[PDB]
Amino acid sequence: ALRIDSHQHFWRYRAADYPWIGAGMGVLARDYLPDALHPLMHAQALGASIAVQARAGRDETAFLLELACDEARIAAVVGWEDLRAPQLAERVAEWRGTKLRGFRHQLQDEADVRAFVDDADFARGVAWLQANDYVYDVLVFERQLPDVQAFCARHDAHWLVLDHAGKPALAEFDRDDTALARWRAALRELAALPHVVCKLSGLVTEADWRRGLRASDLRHIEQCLDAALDAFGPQRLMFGSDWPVCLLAASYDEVASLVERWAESRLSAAERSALWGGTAARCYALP
Ligand SMILES: [Zn+2]
Ligand SMILES: [Zn+2]
Ligand SMILES: [Zn+2]
Ligand SMILES: [Zn+2]
Numbered sequence: 001a002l003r004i005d006s007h008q009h010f011w012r013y014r015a016a017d018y019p020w021i022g023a024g025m026g027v028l029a030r031d032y033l034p035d036a037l038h039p040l041m042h043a044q045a046l047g048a049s050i051a052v053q054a055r056a057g058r059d060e061t062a063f064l065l066e067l068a069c070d071e072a073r074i075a076a077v078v079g080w081e082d083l084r085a086p087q088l089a090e091r092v093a094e095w096r097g098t099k100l101r102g103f104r105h106q107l108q109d110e111a112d113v114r115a116f117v118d119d120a121d122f123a124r125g126v127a128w129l130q131a132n133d134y135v136y137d138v139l140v141f142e143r144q145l146p147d148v149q150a151f152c153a154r155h156d157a158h159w160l161v162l163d164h165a166g167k168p169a170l171a172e173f174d175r176d177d178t179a180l181a182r183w184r185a186a187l188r189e190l191a192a193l194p195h196v197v198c199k200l201s202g203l204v205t206e207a208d209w210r211r212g213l214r215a216s217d218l219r220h221i222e223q224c225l226d227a228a229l230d231a232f233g234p235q236r237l238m239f240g241s242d243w244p245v246c247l248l249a250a251s252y253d254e255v256a257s258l259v260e261r262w263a264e265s266r267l268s269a270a271e272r273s274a275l276w277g278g279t280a281a282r283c284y285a286l287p
Contacts, residue, residue: 002286004075004277005041005049007163007201007240010034010067017055020109024210025248032244034067034074040243040252041073047277048075050240050284052137053104056080061095068099075286076101078137083125092132101284102135102161113144117151130157135284138196139163142179145186156195159283164202164242165228166190171208173220180220184227191231197283198232200225200259200275201240209249218258225262234271238279 011018012031021028041049051064051074061079068074076099081091083105092100110116117123129136138160140148145166152160166187172179190196203224207217228237239259246255263272280286 001273002048002075002277002281003044003046004239004280004286005044005046005241005243006238006277006280006284007052007199008037008049008243009054009245010037010051010064011054027247028244034071037243038073040241043253044256046256048073048286050074050076050078050101050280052078053080056106058082058091061100065095065098065100074099076284078102078104078135080104081125083129084119084121085125086121088125088128092134100134101286102137103129104137104139104163106139107148108140108144108167113140114147114150117148123151123154126151126155127157130155133158133285135159135161137161137163137199140166142167142169142183142186145183145190149186149189152190152193152196156193158195160193160196161238161283162187162190162196162198164206165198165200165224167202167206168224170203170206170217170220170224173223174216180223180227183224184231187227188231191236197236197238197279198228199238199240200228201238201255202242202245204246204249204255204258205242207249213249221258222262225259226266229266234267235274235279237275238283239276 010033013029053060057080064077068077079100081088081103107113126136138148168183169179203221204213207213241252241255243252263275
């Protein structure tokens with residue numbers, strides 16, 4: 001039974017190359033490389049991780065695959081390509097033989113997510129990915145979930161992974177008594193598709209981390225974990241740390257422990273084994 005952190009990032013920091021790292025995120029404005037990640041996974045008895053593109057550009061893919069090439073603690077890479085380019089097939093061929101297992105576009109930052117995913121060229125690209133057993137990670141804000149519903153139903157030839165449980169507006173749960181229900185309804189609509197699975201990661205950072213995580217935030221996160229479990233089922237949940245991004249809000253140990261405590265309560269031993277690497281292993285085709 002593999003134990004896998006299914007979602008983390010690496011980078012040599014350069015401000016202009018990571019526009020999403022902005023004011024007040026000083027902790028991220030430095031290098032994070034596999035050597036810093038190792039002890040963190042060691043403490044959680046995690047054996048290997050999956051490195052996910054942290055910026056747009058083929059060079060990010062090159063970078064991650066270089067880090068990964070001969071490092072056993074990196075089991076796969078989720079890269080970046082322009083999926084709308086007709087040259088997509090020839091460019092991906094450059095990564096043949098490698099640990100590349102999937103792709104991700106930062107849909108959340110698009111101005112018209114729905115127009116973007118429904119685009120005929122992008123659609124053609126995602127269809128090619130699926131025809132070739134590449135996973136596609138879906139990264140959207142909670143409000144954008146209905147915008148990708150038709151896109152996820154359409155692309156059903158291979159696994160789609162919903163990143164960060166679709167980012168519930170955790171900071172709003174006490175101001176907005178519709179926030180949890182709205183997201184749960186959309187989550188359920190996606191989870192009804194058998195080829196879509198869910199990453200349980202990136203939750204601490206949807207809370208109001210600038211003020212500091214509080215006990216109420218942890219309770220809301222458990223409500224989201226419970227809703228994810230109900231909608232997806234225990235065999236379609238995948239742990240990820242979202243390190244180093246999670247450091248805005250919590251330590252790696254804190255991120256794993258809150259999932260661990262929740263899992264000991266809700267899941268059987270075999271289901272925990274799925275959560276902690278079994279599901280990532282089968283969906284990303286890990287050895
Ligand atoms: Zn070790
Ligand atoms: Zn190599
Ligand atoms: Zn296939
Ligand atoms: Zn991430």
